[PDB]
Amino acid sequence: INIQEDKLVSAHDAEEILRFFNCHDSALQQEATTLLTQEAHLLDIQAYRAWLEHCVGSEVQYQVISRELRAASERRYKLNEAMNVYNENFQQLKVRVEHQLDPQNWGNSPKLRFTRFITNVQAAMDVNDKELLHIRSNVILHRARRGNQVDVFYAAREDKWKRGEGGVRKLVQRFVDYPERILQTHNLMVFL
Amino acid sequence: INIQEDKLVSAHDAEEILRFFNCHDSALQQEATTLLTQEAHLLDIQAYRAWLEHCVGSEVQYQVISRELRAASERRYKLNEAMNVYNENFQQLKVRVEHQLDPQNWGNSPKLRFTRFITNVQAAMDVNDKELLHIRSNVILHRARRGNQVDVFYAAREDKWKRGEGGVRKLVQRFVDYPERILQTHNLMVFL
Amino acid sequence: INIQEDKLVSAHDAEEILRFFNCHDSALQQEATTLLTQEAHLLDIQAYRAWLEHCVGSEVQYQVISRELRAASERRYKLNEAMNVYNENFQQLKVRVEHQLDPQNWGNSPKLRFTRFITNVQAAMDVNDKELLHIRSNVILHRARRGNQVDVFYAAREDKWKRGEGGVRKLVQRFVDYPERILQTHNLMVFL
Amino acid sequence: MNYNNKILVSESGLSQKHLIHGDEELFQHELKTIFARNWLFLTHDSLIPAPGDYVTAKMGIDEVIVSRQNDGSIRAFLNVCRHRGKTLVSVEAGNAKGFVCSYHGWGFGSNGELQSVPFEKDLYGESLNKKCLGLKEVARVESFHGFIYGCFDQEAPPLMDYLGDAAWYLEPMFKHSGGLELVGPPGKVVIKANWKAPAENFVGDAYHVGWTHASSLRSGESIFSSLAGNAALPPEGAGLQMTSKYGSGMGVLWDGYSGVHSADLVPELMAFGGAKQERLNKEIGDVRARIYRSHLNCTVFPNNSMLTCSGVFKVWNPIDANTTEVWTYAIVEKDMPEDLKRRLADSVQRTFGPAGFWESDDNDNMETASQNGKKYQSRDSDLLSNLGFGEDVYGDAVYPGVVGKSAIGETSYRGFYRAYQAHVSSSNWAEFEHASSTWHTELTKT
Amino acid sequence: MNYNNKILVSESGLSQKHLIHGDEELFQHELKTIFARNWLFLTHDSLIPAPGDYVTAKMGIDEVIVSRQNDGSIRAFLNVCRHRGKTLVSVEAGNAKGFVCSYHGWGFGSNGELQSVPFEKDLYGESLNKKCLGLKEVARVESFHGFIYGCFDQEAPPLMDYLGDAAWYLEPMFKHSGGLELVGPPGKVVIKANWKAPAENFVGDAYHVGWTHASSLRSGESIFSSLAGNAALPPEGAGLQMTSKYGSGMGVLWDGYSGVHSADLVPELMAFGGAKQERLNKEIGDVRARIYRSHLNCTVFPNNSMLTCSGVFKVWNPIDANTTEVWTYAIVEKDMPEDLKRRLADSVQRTFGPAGFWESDDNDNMETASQNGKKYQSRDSDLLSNLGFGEDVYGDAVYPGVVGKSAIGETSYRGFYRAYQAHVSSSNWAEFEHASSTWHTELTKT
Amino acid sequence: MNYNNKILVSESGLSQKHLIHGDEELFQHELKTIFARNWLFLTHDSLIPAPGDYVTAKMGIDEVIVSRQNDGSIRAFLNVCRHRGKTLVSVEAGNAKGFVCSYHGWGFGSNGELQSVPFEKDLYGESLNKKCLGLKEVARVESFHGFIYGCFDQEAPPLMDYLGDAAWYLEPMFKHSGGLELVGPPGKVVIKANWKAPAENFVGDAYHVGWTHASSLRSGESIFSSLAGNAALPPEGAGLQMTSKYGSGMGVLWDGYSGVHSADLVPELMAFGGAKQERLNKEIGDVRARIYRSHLNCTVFPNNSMLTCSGVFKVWNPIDANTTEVWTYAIVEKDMPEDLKRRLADSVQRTFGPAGFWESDDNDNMETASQNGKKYQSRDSDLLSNLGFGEDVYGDAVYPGVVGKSAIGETSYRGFYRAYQAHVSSSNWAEFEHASSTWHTELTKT
Numbered sequence A, B, C: 001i002n003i004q005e006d007k008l009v010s011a012h013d014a015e016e017i018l019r020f021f022n023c024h025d026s027a028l029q030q031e032a033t034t035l036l037t038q039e040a041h042l043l044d045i046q047a048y049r050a051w052l053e054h055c056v057g058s059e060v061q062y063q064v065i066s067r068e069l070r071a072a073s074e075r076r077y078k079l080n081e082a083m084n085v086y087n088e089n090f091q092q093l094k095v096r097v098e099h100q101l102d103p104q105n106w107g108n109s110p111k112l113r114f115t116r117f118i119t120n121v122q123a124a125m126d127v128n129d130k131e132l133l134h135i136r137s138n139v140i141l142h143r144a145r146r147g148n149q150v151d152v153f154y155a156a157r158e159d160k161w162k163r164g165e166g167g168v169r170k171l172v173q174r175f176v177d178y179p180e181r182i183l184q185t186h187n188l189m190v191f192l
Numbered sequence D, E, F: 001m002n003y004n005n006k007i008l009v010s011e012s013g014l015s016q017k018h019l020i021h022g023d024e025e026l027f028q029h030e031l032k033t034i035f036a037r038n039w040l041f042l043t044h045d046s047l048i049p050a051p052g053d054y055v056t057a058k059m060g061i062d063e064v065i066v067s068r069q070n071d072g073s074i075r076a077f078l079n080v081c082r083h084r085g086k087t088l089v090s091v092e093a094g095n096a097k098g099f100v101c102s103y104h105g106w107g108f109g110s111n112g113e114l115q116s117v118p119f120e121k122d123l124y125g126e127s128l129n130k131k132c133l134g135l136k137e138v139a140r141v142e143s144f145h146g147f148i149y150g151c152f153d154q155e156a157p158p159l160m161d162y163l164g165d166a167a168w169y170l171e172p173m174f175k176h177s178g179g180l181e182l183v184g185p186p187g188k189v190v191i192k193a194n195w196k197a198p199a200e201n202f203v204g205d206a207y208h209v210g211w212t213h214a215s216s217l218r219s220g221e222s223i224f225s226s227l228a229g230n231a232a233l234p235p236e237g238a239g240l241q242m243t244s245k246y247g248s249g250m251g252v253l254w255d256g257y258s259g260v261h262s263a264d265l266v267p268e269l270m271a272f273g274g275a276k277q278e279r280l281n282k283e284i285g286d287v288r289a290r291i292y293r294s295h296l297n298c299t300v301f302p303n304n305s306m307l308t309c310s311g312v313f314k315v316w317n318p319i320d321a322n323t324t325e326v327w328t329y330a331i332v333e334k335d336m337p338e339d340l341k342r343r344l345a346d347s348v349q350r351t352f353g354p355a356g357f358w359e360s361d362d363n364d365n366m367e368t369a370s371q372n373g374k375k376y377q378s379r380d381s382d383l384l385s386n387l388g389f390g391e392d393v394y395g396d397a398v399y400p401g402v403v404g405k406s407a408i409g410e411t412s413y414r415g416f417y418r419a420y421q422a423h424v425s426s427s428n429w430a431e432f433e434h435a436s437s438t439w440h441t442e443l444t445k446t
């Protein structure tokens, strides 16, 4: 991709494309699909401790941004482009998990219902770090609670996964640029 | 998963996780994906007779429940937890299929449009019955009719499939615990 | 499928089923999934020129129809059944791409956000043209813009793909029969 | 609109303005004159049998907590905290001695009393009069053979008198059968119809069955199946219709004890009902024993409907003029074998539940009839309910109420809408009574 | 709001209160004073050519069935059953001798008459007066060269008189070309705009084209493309604007027969239109033959718009003050080769259909202008339509109506909104006429 | 409803009718009497520091463009084109010398003036009076230590006087700290609550913290954490409450400089605030230096809230009676190290942003309390705000305003709602003042 010609494409997005267009390894795509399907299963059943133990690396950065709407031609205004809905290390994820499991989390009674749909999985090993796996995937996340509250979230996830304790591949970075600027879901209190 | 630690996880959900975490057989996941994609295709084109013939076992139980909202701490109230939106044997599915195909089903003119999205497929052979295949998958089901009616359904499906006549794998159990307590789709008159 | 028995099934849909029920080639399904995932990635990042170059054949027909609601028993009224939301050759797609990239396309500032979810991939080689690949897939397409505008599109795609310049498989036909008769998405200005 | 003067329902209930199914100002007026005034279904003893058991229920658009007290009575309260108005209970059913508000922690008893306030001594001292801060109580709660209804209006007639002539028809199944149980939890589905559309259909509408339910009759394997596609009219004397002073009414289809149940259940049911009927002949007489095992399609005014024998129990919970939340329970006879009760409950949901194939047949009818009531050229149009008019009787020696001695007619529509109009144009129960002093004469004209 | 007194549109149509695009009470008032009163587009002969052919259409928020009778006439009826008000027809087009209601099976003829009632003899006996139970008929249905319009108000002027001075401009294409066909089915899309936003844009708005459609002009390969990004103003005498007593109006862009069509179609079209123009010079004169092959952007008051030559035909169907359902058909000349008709139809949808790239350019303009009319600080603000004011004429020797002899102006806005205000403040056609007795003098002031 | 006479808030602010959180007619009335009348938060200097920098903001339901002028002042204008009313700016922030309308290309300056019109000479000639066609300007724009507020009402008091007694409490952090920066962009989330629900919670509500935020207190690793589950009441003298004439108020929790921030940030913050407090003792005195490093939960009437020290800055943007768009920024002290500012900003969003786990605790409380205000049996019910009544003072020698000398009470609710009721029942500022001439006496009764 030439971004001077493809005028709507960001440098960041062009760089990510290049990653997956080269070595395609079908076996790696299959492993990545398994990994993400198992992760989503654990989250959907609200096994948040199991998710941390089995899916999340100690060095993780778990980040979801919301980017301010700016002019496509803008070139002078320079201030912080985005805020962090999430930008969590492992200890901060653990705080959120404890908050979910606390018996005085009144919003969790009656129990929530989560269903996740993971699609468009791509996987590529890092060029320079042969032990770093880049995985991209898209998620639809359906949250239902309290008879008639239904919230559906849509996002693309840029992940890095690496083998950790016991040789288990674990999430070391997730980056989501959330596509809806104003949330119409009451909150973003879900793990994308 | 230890459900005394992972306080939000049900015994049932923990049991189902264990099933897929053990023997992973990539070939079985692929077969299951084919099976479910073909099933969804037949349903989407409203080939309900073909669906019964090719996809549904004579011993089937086809069940979708709606569970009453109870306190997460509840431990005394003991009455029926759920009702059956569907709990059909083969003959009961056949009744529903005949109802769909009847030319005096006025609600089916003009013809409905269905689109199904099947994701998160996992497959594992039963431990004790080497001929029983457990398949889990999630579905988004889009139903459109009458110019501006649009209903979207979201669910996780716990299936058992077994080889039947001609060696064709057929559905012997489907269980769905429908995640929305109050339906906002006019009805649940769709085969999830 | 016998459409005299399966009364709701169209001849067209029955013909398409038959295509995928025969030779199943697992490797072809995997290739098709890659192809479609890469296509969706290029579209999602708005690399429309790259999409034309890498994904779209010079002989393409890109067609999305909207079919008039008629009685299921109708057999006398004979006039045009459908209109073309899209029915584009390569030059017409190129016009649409230039329209997207034009810096006076005011509706594209602030930049749109697209997320596509591709599922239910099936692939089969043509019987008579050994170089023609039939691919079917379903798409959910999420478009977000302007803080609180969110439009979600749902469709099944009947594609034909063929190897073109450099041996790269490219789209030579896409056919979508759009399932919602009255659009509730402001427009259908998205590439399904 | 001036509800004192506007003729929304014509004399004798013969027609109604189509706007009644669409007009949001009228909907808001119904909240006052229908839902805040009349008896509304809450729950059954079988769902809150033990002290501390509770459920939530709607009464109109309001939500209430319905709780079994220690003394065995039932009391119901608004599900709204007396402090800053938060919803107190977020679940549908449970067992508790009280309810604690998740906002500031105020604790109310199962009896509605404000029992505790966090740090009351340090914060309020002796200044908080907790005796005046109990949950807002539903004034009237009464039982009809285990079926519990509530009414916000202290001036309402007792539930039994409110059932009027309908009670005589319900008693063989509700009382003389040994009693019924409600099998929960209900199905819950929102439909885009006015609450009156399904209410009127269940009260009074046998005419639609053959045509609307043609596919369900043909496919579904049932006892009324000769009706499919209007292939056959019920024979002479196959049933009757009735209505009552306070708007409740029903159809009676003689002998149809297996109701909508598919051939799978028909022999078992027909045996069970016949056997009980033989015992009841001695106790309540042949006519009433026969009524026990006859299919009743009934609406208990305003918005509770049922099909006895089929075992369908419905609440049409109002949301707005074109939105209703449909609750569906199964009713079973207590002395049926447990395995039969289980299969009956599933069959009720199979036919009339959220994926009820019979209920599905009715969707477009109710939705479009309701939505058309908003359309400009239809607002002032007249919905017709004249079938059988001039052939109804009152004070019959065998069958009480205003009665049409035919299986198919619009007798029960006329009585439903006569009651509806009397309420809409009245400010209180006294005015309703004054407006209803010649109710049966009005209905039996011509 | 008192619609007799409230000045929603200022004298000479020079401005309108922004609230007109947002106010729901005014929307409800328009249902009565605009949509129930004026002529509304239904269909074309080409879509229901044979006896028994029908389509459904909206007239305001009401839905009607439009049916070709055996005698070759067309009649239209409310799509609402006369019994309990169910929607009768659920499809958009077909062929039938009648329509049967899916609720209780009442059968109506293609002529609207209640023809059958299931079991009438057994149930109603002789008591049902079917003669009085025909579907509610649209009082007036008339044709303009195959284009069929309806009007609920019996007092309306004939369609031809209602077109007023606009008819003279339409006739070369609608009549003298040999006649037009409408190519169905239409595209249908909901937009979050008031129906008047697109109506005003099509009636009168050439000013927006260069800027709004800059990208479509540059990309799209078309005859008006020198306008992209306001790079060039149309030359002197490139066109004109007109308006009429009953609110219809249009722009005329001389010679632009290929319209918005991409370079693919330009040579073919320019040849075809030129060749027909040469024949028409002899029959209708050079000016009117030229008008035939000139691009007309027209609104037939209230809510039907078109671009002749481009072949775009639009209905802006009202839903609420900020919601409109847009129907898009293609118009073609009957004597064009069939392959050209096919490509023209696709090109109309390509440019102005549901995925119309030109139409897409207009979305935000119409949506936000409409939605801003709800905002507190904008409700009482003045939308301006003064461009060209004081240069319009009436009674010109060549071009009839109130005419601005320039390609770009707001002449047609002024006439549209003068008619709109006269209707909104009038109770009937007689009052509209009284309010319009000096219409052209008002529009040509200063 | 007659807003001159209707008692929506009882004497001394002791209770409010629950309908105030649900009634759409009252919401529309608030647009006039609250939002068009009072000071509303727009932006901070730190977000538009350079000439030409702009942001969009809501003022009530209206949208404005807020622009740094060349002379260093800030002006704000309706985001609506003066021609046909299109929304002018579609982005949230940027830098420009002007704004061009995408409909017909009219160009407005950063100063609001209509600077250019395409083809003005050829089209309008000299007839367009551009001097009268500037964007509709926000009458009043003023700064409180870099925090920019707007007011549509020219008659309003100056911002500083409007802050009343609240300003004294804010100044140590807003002024004497060296000044604050707002860290953008904000989080934006829609909640199904009335704007007053979060407004009242932030102004005045320490009572909810231990119970509502039990899980966040226990999990979250913070300085107020002894409160989890009402395990411990704050000690005597742990804080105070205040309120003011124009409705602004706050709680003061002495010394809680690390606020809601998790143990990760506690030591660093407690060191930084303590060190600055030591310097400020000499400049502003020990009490006010202590206030600087004390946690203030404040609402600047009507709909701007903040938690100082925690660094949470909120705008509760009204949409309708049960819908609010929540904007969340972080506030930081300018002289903090940049790495600390970064971590503080993330922590604000972590706790109170779109995925704020603390903010999440409040959702159901605000949503259901709001939605219950629509329910028939609750509309006329009384929301209570009597905690601490009869113990407030005015004119204290140390702490100004109406003050409750306790950490937990409803002092600030009472002052908020007294101001609210005075505005709702008044037609202008003069009437508000007349209605408020005994404001503090009313609040300190008994």
Ligand SMILES: Cc1cccc([N+](=O)[O-])c1
Pocket (backbone or CB within 6 Å): D201, D202, D203, D204, D205, D206, D209, D260, D297, D307, D358
């Ligand atoms: C299945 C059935 C049988 C009799 C009556 C009704 N109804 O009024 O709905 C339904």
Ligand SMILES: Cc1cccc([N+](=O)[O-])c1
Pocket (backbone or CB within 6 Å): E201, E202, E203, E204, E205, E206, E209, E260, E297, E307, E358
């Ligand atoms: C493409 C085009 C050309 C002339 C006029 C209009 N219009 O008023 O929408 C559109």
Ligand SMILES: Cc1cccc([N+](=O)[O-])c1
Pocket (backbone or CB within 6 Å): F201, F202, F203, F204, F205, F206, F209, F260, F297, F307, F358
């Ligand atoms: C975390 C916190 C601490 C004090 C006050 C509030 N409040 O009023 O929302 C919140």
Ligand code: FES
Pocket (backbone or CB within 6 Å): D081, D082, D083, D084, D085, D086, D101, D102, D103, D104, D105, D106
């Ligand atoms: S709202 Fe219930 S305790 Fe305050």
Ligand code: FES
Pocket (backbone or CB within 6 Å): E081, E082, E083, E084, E085, E086, E101, E102, E103, E104, E105, E106
């Ligand atoms: S509503 Fe049409 S036949 Fe009864």
Ligand code: FES
Pocket (backbone or CB within 6 Å): F081, F082, F083, F084, F085, F086, F101, F102, F103, F104, F105, F106
């Ligand atoms: S609406 Fe802005 S220039 Fe016309």
Ligand SMILES: [Fe+3]
Pocket (backbone or CB within 6 Å): D201, D208, D209, D212, D213, D358, D362
């Ligand atoms: Fe029915």
Ligand SMILES: [Fe+3]
Pocket (backbone or CB within 6 Å): E201, E208, E209, E212, E213, E358, E362
């Ligand atoms: Fe345009």
Ligand SMILES: [Fe+3]
Pocket (backbone or CB within 6 Å): F201, F208, F209, F212, F213, F358, F362
């Ligand atoms: Fe809080």
